[PDB]
Amino acid sequence: PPSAKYGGRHTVTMIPGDGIGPELMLHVKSVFRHACVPVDFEEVHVSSNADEEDIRNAIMAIRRNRVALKGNIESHKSRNNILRTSLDLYANVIHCKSLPGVVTRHKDIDILIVRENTEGEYSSLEHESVAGVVESLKIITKAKSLRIAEYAFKLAQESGRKKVTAVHKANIMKLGDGLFLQCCREVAARYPQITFENMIVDNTTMQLVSRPQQFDVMVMPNLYGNIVNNVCAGLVGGPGLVAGANYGHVYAVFETATRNTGKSIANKNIANPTATLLASCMMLDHLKLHSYATSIRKAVLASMDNENMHTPDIGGQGTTSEAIQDVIRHIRVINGRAV
Amino acid sequence: QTIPPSAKYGGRHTVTMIPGDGIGPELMLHVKSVFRHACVPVDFEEVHVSSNADEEDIRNAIMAIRRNRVALKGNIETNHNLPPSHKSRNNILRTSLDLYANVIHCKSLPGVVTRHKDIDILIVRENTEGEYSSLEHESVAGVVESLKIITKAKSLRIAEYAFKLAQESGRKKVTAVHKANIMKLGDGLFLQCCREVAARYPQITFENMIVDNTTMQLVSRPQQFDVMVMPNLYGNIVNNVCAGLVGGPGLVAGANYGHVYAVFETATRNTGKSIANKNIANPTATLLASCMMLDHLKLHSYATSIRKAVLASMDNENMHTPDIGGQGTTSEAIQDVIRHIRVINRA
Amino acid sequence: SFPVTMLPGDGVGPELMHAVKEVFKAAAVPVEFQEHHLSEVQNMASEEKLEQVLSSMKENKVAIIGKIHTPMEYKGELASYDMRLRRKLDLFANVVHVKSLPGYMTRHNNLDLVIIREQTEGEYSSLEHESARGVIECLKIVTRAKSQRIAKFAFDYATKKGRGKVTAVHKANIMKLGDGLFLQCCEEVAELYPKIKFETMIIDNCCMQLVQNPYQFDVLVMPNLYGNIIDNLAAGLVGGAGVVPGESYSAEYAVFETGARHPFAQAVGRNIANPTAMLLSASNMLRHLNLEYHSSMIADAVKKVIKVGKVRTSDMGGYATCHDFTEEICRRVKD
C-alpha cells in the first residue's frame, strides 16, 4: 500500500510495550492532546505475551505508517532485533545533549551517535571448534558501511553540524576497520565542506570525560555503540534523558536510548519521562512538524531548569504526574497551535 | 522474479531464435549460414514456437526470450481464432514482455527500382495503447461501439522513444501522425504528449501532420520524411504503404522493443504458407532484421559489413525473388551475398 | 595473422606446446604466439606479473596454457596461482570434454560427457588460520552469485551443444547451507531451462556410479573441490591426462588447457609425453577462433592417427617418442 496520509492530522503507529511505555504513552498522549497536536495514534500489541505472529500483525501496522514510536520490550533472537530486520532498519541514532536543567560534571554538550544494526553484527554465530575454543566473527560489509556513512553526512548537512568523526580500531584490525575507515574516506571527499576525523576508540573514550565539546557527530560500527552510547548517556545524565531512533530506507522508528524496561519502577509514577518525550520531539522533527517539536523541546528543558521537577534516577524528589502537568503549563497555546 | 542477467560467455553473445511457420525456418538456416560464414560471435538458441502446440508449451518458450535480452523471429500463423479470444501468438509475447515500441525501417534499395527513389524512413508506434482497441460491445442489435484508448503515459514513453531514436542516429525531423481534427481529445492528447518532449530536444525540428495528408504526401514526395510516429492504429496504413513504396514486405526489417527487451521482426507480417519450401522467399528483409539485431548488440562492424553486402547482391538484376519481380532463387542470393561477403578483419 | 599468448606452465608444458608449434607450423595456421614465458611454478620465482599476462590477455582475448603446476608449502601462502590467475581473468567456468576416442580401448567406450567446474569459490580461496596449537580451521566458500553464474553457464552450454540433462553434484546433506545454497541456485535456474531434465546427486554416489555406469550422466556442474576431483576421475576413464582436452571461458576471454593436472610421473622432456590433450584443446581453440577449417582438420588428423594405433605413447599401450607421434600427426595432415 502507500503510507496512509488522510488529509488533516497524520496517522502514526503507537505501541506502549512492556515497562512504563503504557504509563508513558498516555502521558505523551496527554502531551499531544494539550499541544493540540493533529497526530492520531494506532496502538499495537507486543511480545512477552502475544509471541510470534501476533506481533507481526502489529508490524503489519508499522508496515503501513512509515513512522512509529515505541517503548522497550524483554536461541532465536530478540523482538527489537526481529523488528528492525523485518523493517530493514539500519540507522540507529541517539541524541545526547546537555540540559540546562540538570548540571552534570560537564556542560555544553550536543552529540548525535549513529551506528548500524546488522552491519556491526558480532552476534552472527560461533563454533565450538574443540572443547573450550570459540570463533566469533566481525562482519564488515562495504555496502552497509557506505550506506551508514552516507546517512551520517547527509544528516549533518541537514542539521547544520560542522564535524563528523570516524570511531574505529584499524590500528589493531587493519582490514575490518581499515575497510570502514577508507569507506568513510570515500564519502568525506564528496562532502568537502564538512571536516572529517578518525580516532581510535580508546583515545575517543578518554576525550569524552575530558573534552566532549570537541564532538559534534560520531559515526562508528554498531559494536562500539554500547560503550560510546551508554557513556554519552551518563555523560548528560543517564538513561531517562537521551532520545533514540531507528531509521530505515523508508521506515523510521523512534524509541528511548537505553532499552531498559525498568520493571522495578512500575506504576510508581517515578520514572523519568524526559527521553520518552524527546523521542516524540525528534519524531515530530521527522514529520517536519518542527513548530510542534520546538515547543515541546524548549518546554521540557525550561521546565527542567527547576530542581523539584527532576526524577529519582537523576537526583530529584518529584514524580511524573507533576513534571508532566508542569510541562503542560509551559506549553504556550494560542488558538489551537503552539506559539 | 527469479530472472538472472543475460550474459555473454567469452565472446559469443547467446541470442534466442524462433523458426515459426512457413517461410520462417527455411530462411533462418541461411541467416545461420550467413553468420557462420561471417564469423559472427552470436550463438543461436532455437525454440520451436507455435502452430504445433499453442497451449502452454510455447510459454516454456517465452522463457528463453526473457533470458537473453535479444531475440530474432520469423512469423507464426494466426490462431484459427476458434478460441477467438485474443491469443495472438505473436501478440501474447509482446504483451508478457511489455514490448511497447514497434519500429520498421523502410529504405530505398539501389538495386530495387521503385516509382520513387532515395527514401529513408523510421516508423514508430505503440501496441497496447496506440488505439487498435478490442472490446466492441453490442449495446442493442444492429449497434456496435468501439473504444479507441489513449493513455497519456504510454504516449510519452513512445514519444521519448521517437526522439531518443533521432539523437543517437543523427536524424533531423520527427513528424507526428494523428487525426486530432476529428478526435480533438484523443489525438490532441497524443499531440500535446509529443509537444512536451519536443521541447526537451530543441535541436530536433518537430512537426505534426494529419493522417490523411500524410498518406498523400508519401506517394508524391516521401523523401521529406525522416522519422514518423503515431499510435498503433494508423501504423498498419503507414507501414504497409511505406513498405510498398520501397518494394514489398520482403524488404523491410522490423523490431519490437521493450523497456529492456528487444525483439527483431520482419517489416511485413506475411506467413508465406503458400510458398512453403519453394526456395523462393525473399530473404532481404529477414537478413536486414539480423543487421539491426547486430546494431543493437553494438557490433556495427559486422552489421555494416553484412548491410553493404545485401545491398551489394541485390543490385544485380538476377538475384531478385519472385515477390518483387525477379527470376532467381534464395540459394543463389544467400550465396551471392556470401560471395559479396569478403573476409574482413580470418581465413 | 592472429597472435595468441602461450603459457607453457611446468612439467611437460613447454614440451607439449613445441609439438603444437610443429603441428601448427605444419597446417599453416595463421597464429603467432606471443609467448608470455614461465608463469612461475617455482621454475622461476615469479608473481604479480599476472597483470602482464592479463595485458596481452586484454588484447588477444584468448590464450592456451600448459599447467601451472602448483607448489606445496612454498611461496609463503602458495595461494593457488591458476585460480589466482583465474581470479584475474575471472575464469569461473572450467569445462573438460570427456570423449572416448576411436582407437584408445579402455575399460569404458563410446562415452561422451562434459564436466563443468567453478574455479573461484570453494576451498581454493586459501582461508586458513590457527585457532590453537595444532587446531587448524579452513574455510569453504560458496557465493550464490558465482554459483548462479556457473549454473547459468551450465544450462546455456547444454542448450548450445544440445545436451540432454545436467546433474548437479553436491554434498549438501552435510553442509546443508553451503552446498545447500549452491544446490538451490541450480534448481532456481534448472526451472528456467525446462527443456532440460535436471538431477542432484550426492558427490560420492556420483563417483561410484561413474566407475560402474558413467553413461547415465550427461552434463555435470559442481563447485571447485568436487570439480578438481571429478575432472581427474573422468579423464582416467576416457584415456588419461594425455588425451583429455580442457577449456576455461570467461566473460569475454577464453582459455584452453589440458583437462587433468598432468602425468604424475616425471617424464620431463624425455620426449615420451603425449601431445593429444593439448592438440584437441588447441583445435577446440581454432574452433573458437573462427578458423573452423584448421580446427576440423587437426582433430581429424589427431583422431585418425589414434584410431590407426600403429603409433602410441607410453600412456596408450605403446612405446613411441613425442616427436615420433608428432611427426605422424604432421605426416597424416600433409597429404
From Swiss-Prot, chain B:
Function (record text): Regulatory subunit which plays a role in the allosteric regulation of the enzyme catalyzing the decarboxylation of isocitrate (ICT) into alpha-ketoglutarate. The heterodimer composed of the alpha (IDH3A) and beta (IDH3B) subunits and the heterodimer composed of the alpha (IDH3A) and gamma (IDH3G) subunits, have considerable basal activity but the full activity of the heterotetramer (containing two subunits of IDH3A, one of IDH3B and one of IDH3G) requires the assembly and cooperative function of both heterodimers.
Main location: mitochondrion
Single Gene Ontology BP annotation: tricarboxylic acid cycle
PROSITE patterns from the UniProt entry: IDH_IMDH (PS00470)
Record carries keyword Nucleotide-binding: yes
Record's keyword terms, sorted: ATP-binding, Magnesium, Manganese, Metal-binding, Mitochondrion, Nucleotide-binding, Transit peptide, Tricarboxylic acid cycle
Binding positions (citrate): T78, N91
Name of the coding gene: IDH3G
Cofactor(s) recorded in Swiss-Prot or TrEMBL: Mg(2+); Mn(2+)
One protein family per Pfam: Iso_dh
Cofactor remark from the record: Divalent metal cations; Mn(2+) or Mg(2+). Activity higher in presence of Mn(2+) than of Mg(2+). Binds 1 Mg(2+) or Mn(2+) ion per subunit.
Regulation (activators, inhibitors): The heterotetramer and the heterodimer composed of IDH3A and IDH3G subunits can be allosterically activated by citrate (CIT) or/and ADP, and the two activators can act independently or synergistically. The heterodimer composed of IDH3A and IDH3B subunits cannot be allosterically regulated and the allosteric regulation of the heterotetramer is through the IDH3G subunit and not the IDH3B subunit.
Name of the featured protein: Isocitrate dehydrogenase [NAD] subunit gamma, mitochondrial
Lineage, highest ranks first: Eukaryota, Metazoa, Chordata, Craniata, Vertebrata
Organism for this UniProt entry: Homo sapiens (Human)
Record-listed substrate binding positions: R94, R125, D212
Binding site for ADP: N270, T271, N282
Protein's cellular compartments: Mitochondrion
Effect of N91A: Significantly impairs the activation of the heterodimer composed of IDH3A and IDH3G subunits by citrate
Record note on what altering Y234F does: Significantly impairs the activation of the heterodimer composed of IDH3A and IDH3G subunits by citrate and ADP
Consequence the record notes for mutating T271A: Significantly impairs the activation of the heterodimer composed of IDH3A and IDH3G subunits by ADP
Effect annotated for changing K273A: No significant effect on the activation of the heterodimer composed of IDH3A and IDH3G subunits by ADP
Phenotype for K148A: Complete loss of the activation of the heterotetramer and the heterodimer composed of IDH3A and IDH3G subunits by citrate and ADP
Molecular-function GO terms, alphabetical: ATP binding; isocitrate dehydrogenase (NAD+) activity; magnesium ion binding; NAD binding
Residue sites binding Mn(2+) per the record: D212
Curated annotation (Swiss-Prot), chain C:
Keywords, alphabetical: Acetylation, Disease variant, Mitochondrion, Retinitis pigmentosa, Transit peptide, Tricarboxylic acid cycle
GO CC annotation terms, alphabetical: isocitrate dehydrogenase complex (NAD+); mitochondrial matrix; mitochondrion; nucleus
GO biological process terms, semicolon-separated: isocitrate metabolic process; tricarboxylic acid cycle
MF-aspect GO terms: electron transfer activity; isocitrate dehydrogenase (NAD+) activity; magnesium ion binding; NAD binding
Taxonomy, superkingdom: Eukaryota
Places the protein is found: Mitochondrion
UniProt keyword Hydrolase present: no
Activity regulation details: The heterotetramer and the heterodimer composed of IDH3A and IDH3G subunits can be allosterically activated by citrate (CIT) or/and ADP, and the two activators can act independently or synergistically. The heterodimer composed of IDH3A and IDH3B subunits cannot be allosterically regulated and the allosteric regulation of the heterotetramer is through the IDH3G subunit and not the IDH3B subunit.
Residues recorded as bearing N6-acetyllysine in the entry: K152
Record: disease: Retinitis pigmentosa 46: A retinal dystrophy belonging to the group of pigmentary retinopathies. Retinitis pigmentosa is characterized by retinal pigment deposits visible on fundus examination and primary loss of rod photoreceptor cells followed by secondary loss of cone photoreceptors. Patients typically have night vision blindness and loss of midperipheral visual field. As their condition progresses, they lose their far peripheral visual field and eventually central vision as well.
Annotated function: Plays a structural role to facilitate the assembly and ensure the full activity of the enzyme catalyzing the decarboxylation of isocitrate (ICT) into alpha-ketoglutarate. The heterodimer composed of the alpha (IDH3A) and beta (IDH3B) subunits and the heterodimer composed of the alpha (IDH3A) and gamma (IDH3G) subunits, have considerable basal activity but the full activity of the heterotetramer (containing two subunits of IDH3A, one of IDH3B and one of IDH3G) requires the assembly and cooperative function of both heterodimers.
Family designation: Belongs to the isocitrate and isopropylmalate dehydrogenases family.
Oligomeric and partner information: Heterooligomer of subunits alpha (IDH3A), beta (IDH3B), and gamma (IDH3G) in the apparent ratio of 2:1:1. The heterodimer containing one IDH3A and one IDH3B subunit and the heterodimer containing one IDH3A and one IDH3G subunit assemble into a heterotetramer (which contains two subunits of IDH3A, one of IDH3B and one of IDH3G) and further into the heterooctamer.
Name of the molecule in the record: Isocitrate dehydrogenase [NAD] subunit beta, mitochondrial
Species, as recorded: Homo sapiens (Human)
Whole-protein coverage range: 48 to 368 of 385
